[PDB]
Amino acid sequence: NAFEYLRTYVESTTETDAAVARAREDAAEFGLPAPDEMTGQLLTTLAATTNGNGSTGAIAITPAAGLVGLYILNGLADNTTLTCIDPESEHQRQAKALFREAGYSPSRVRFLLSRPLDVMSRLANDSYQLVFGQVSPMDLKALVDAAWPLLRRGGALVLADALLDGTIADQTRKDRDTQAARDADEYIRSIEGAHVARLPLGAGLTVVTKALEHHH
Amino acid sequence: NAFEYLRTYVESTTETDAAVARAREDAAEFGLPAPDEMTGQLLTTLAATTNGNGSTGAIAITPAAGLVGLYILNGLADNTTLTCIDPESEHQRQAKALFREAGYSPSRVRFLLSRPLDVMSRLANDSYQLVFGQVSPMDLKALVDAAWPLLRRGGALVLADALLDGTIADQTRKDRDTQAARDADEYIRSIEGAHVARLPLGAGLTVVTKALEHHH
Secondary structure: OHHHHHHHHHHOOOOOOHHHHHHHHHHHHOOOOOOOHHHHHHHHHHHHHOOOOOOOEEEEEOOOHHHHHHHHHHHOOOOOEEEEEOOOHHHHHHHHHHHHHOOOOHHHEEEEOOOHHHHHHHOOOOOEEEEEEOOOOOOHHHHHHHHHHHEEEEEEEEEOOOOHHHOOOOOOOOOHHHHHHHHHHHHHOOOOOEEEEEEOOOOOEEEEEEOOOOOO | OHHHHHHHHHHOOOOOOHHHHHHHHHHHHOOOOOOOHHHHHHHHHHHHHOOOOOOOEEEEEOOOHHHHHHHHHHHOOOOOEEEEEOOOHHHHHHHHHHHHHOOOOHHHEEEEOOOHHHHHHHOOOOOEEEEEEOOOOOOHHHHHHHHHHHEEEEEEEEEOOOOHHHOOOOOOOOOHHHHHHHHHHHHHOOOOOEEEEEEOOOOOEEEEEEOOOOOO
16 A cells, blocks of 8 residues: 555656656566666665776666666766676667667677576676676576675675565465575575665565675 | 565564664664664665765764664774764663674764754765764755765765655645655755665655766
8 A cells, every 4th residue: 555655656756767768668568577666766876875996887687677777877887887688689689779779888888698697607706886686586596696706895786576575484375486585585694794685675675785894 | 565564574584683673672662763674774785885985984863873873883894983963862872872782892883962953064074975864854855955965975865754655745635744845855856966766665765875977
């Protein structure tokens, strides 16, 4: 109930961006998983707060990198890049187009036509300040193991719909997916030197940031 | 409906912290406004992601600075301080005690026994990476004007319950408060070089971070 009145007021009141609205329309036309406006604003916040200094930039692992990427590019420091990863070629065309239409230079974005877990093995460790992942619950754990090394301290890994609306921790709900999402959550909460925040956005967002060195 | 199952699973699954649980019990015993566990985790994330370099640290403006402060201290870099602000002396005793009980050194915290809007005039501009405010809707605008100058670029101002559960933008709802919260929201969305994210936490959280310099 109350979630939607908040959503409605925030959505019906956020100044519309043409490039963003276009990317949201495109994603919907192709049936792609697209984080809502509130989740995107939080992506802009993290891209803006995370440290661009010494950072290559951000990584967006999702079929709809255009929508997500636009939110990230809004906050990211100019001397960093957005690296998008998806194996589908029309998704590469879909993304580069949206960036082109928005006023973005090609030098700010990089698209890797690959399966996420295959190419992350080819990126530099400790070089990224932000990683957004939109994957299947069965890939969550692998994505965490793949992304963690790439993340810099003060860096955040953002996992969309990772909580399956709370579906997890439910006797009735036996499922290949629910069980994988449950193991991911339990696994994520077990890693050391990580800050875990699980928020009421989309189907439940898990953001895990790499802790800085602490005396306490 | 779905918000609580997510909340329940996340709350019932977040590894309990003694110092934090104590601060949450204390706040409840004194009837103080206390952000839930999910909002606190997001505070840790921002304290961890924002830049401690060249920053004095964070500011917590709230009657329950102990609970809020503990979440912030978890992420904040060691070479920064948490500045708490409240005019009530038992709140100062309440906070310093909770920090003392948690393993925190007195050098990491600073308490200013003052009314927020009176003392912010006495702090250094462009020196803070994070400011959390828990105020009345009638003080929101003034808090933004007071906090903005103190915030560094890449810095975030976090305003608790600023959306009044979406209550705003409602013909029926005439009110001294709703009208002030509405003007604050409209005013906040008008400032330039600011990233505004409004999220479904508490009664509606507004976080506005100071944008970095952008060519785009």
